[PDB]
Amino acid sequence: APLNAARPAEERAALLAWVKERLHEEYGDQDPTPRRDPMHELISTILSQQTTHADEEAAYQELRTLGDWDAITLAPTDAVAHAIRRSNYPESKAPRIQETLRRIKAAPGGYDLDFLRDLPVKDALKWLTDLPGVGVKTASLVLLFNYARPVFPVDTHVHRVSTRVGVIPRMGEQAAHRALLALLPPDPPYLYELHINFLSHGRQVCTWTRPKCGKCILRERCDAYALYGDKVPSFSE
Ligand code: SF4
Ligand SMILES: [Mg+2]
Ligand SMILES: [Mg+2]
C-alpha cells in the first residue's frame, strides 16, 4: 500500500542512501565500466547507437587506423564511413564524429576536454550534450568519471534498479538524471561508487527480465518485489 515511489523526497533520498550502502557491501570497488579517456568515450558513444559492444569497439579501432584526430577530421567522410562500417548507420555517424572532433579542436586546448573542469556544471553538460550523437548520460559520465564533477549518469541499469525499488516514480531516462541527482549529495566519489554498483547489480541480479529477487540485497525495501513477488515484469517502455 505505501510504496516508496510516493514518499517524500527526503524519505526517497534516505532509501537511496540505504541502497548505496547495501550495493557497496555486495560489490565494493568492483568496476564494470570501460573507464575510457574522454575523447574515446565520446566517439564510442556516437558509434554505440543500435550497435553491439563488439561491433562498437571494432568500429572505433578501425576508425583509429585512419590516424590521429586531426587526420580523422580532415579525411573524406566516405573514408570515415567505410572505416566505421561495423557500426549501424555508418553514413550518419561519420558526420557526427567529424563535427564533434571539429568542435573539440576549436575549444581551448587540443583534442581534450580539460576546459570542462572549470565550467559551471550545467554549462559543461550543455556543451557536451550539444555535440551530435552525445546524450546526457554520456555527458554526465565524462564529467563525473574524467573530471570529478558532481553529476550522476543514469544508464539503463541505474534507471531500472532505481525505478523498481521506488527511489523515483516511472519517468524518462533524461528526467531521471535530474530526479536522482536531486536525491544525492554533491560528492563525486560517492556518485561514482553508486553508479558502478548499480551497473553491477543490474547486470548480475536486477536484470532486465526475470530479476533474481531471491538473491537481491534490496528485496525487503523494493516496491517491485512488494507488488509482484517472484514475478517482477521486464522493465519496458
Ligand atoms: S528485489 Fe528484484 S526487482 Fe527489486 S531491486 Fe532486487 S532484483 Fe530488482
Ligand atoms: Mg581543443
Ligand atoms: Mg547531443
Numbering used by the authors: 19 to 255
Task: Quote the study that presented this structure, word for word.
DrEndoIII1 displays a lower activity towards the common substrates and act mostly as a monofunctional DNA glycosylase. Previous comparative structural analysis suggested that amino acid substitutions in two DNA interacting loops (DIL1 and DIL2) and in the FeS cluster loop (a structurally conserved DNA binding motif) could be the origin of the reduced activity of DrEndoIII1. In DrEndoIII1 we substituted Arg61 and Tyr100 in DIL1 and DIL2 with the equivalent residues found in DrEndoIII2 (Glu and Leu). Compared to previous analysis of wild-type DrEndoIII1, which results in full product formation using the same enzyme and substrate concentration, DrEndoIII1 R61Q processed approximately one-third (25 nM) of the substrate compared to the native enzyme. Our results demonstrate that the affinity of the DrEndoIII1 mutants for the substrates (with THF:G mispair and C:G pair) is reduced when compared with the wild-type enzyme. In the case of the R61Q mutant, this probably originates from the substitution of a positively charged residue with a neutral one. The crystal structures were determined and refined to resolutions of 1.38, 1.95 and 1.89 Å for DrEndoIII1 R61Q, DrEndoIII1 Y100L and DrEndoIII3 G250T/N251H, respectively. Additionally, the DrEndoIII1 R61Q and Y100L crystal structures include two magnesium ions, and the DrEndoIII3 G250T/N251H crystal structure has two chloride ions.
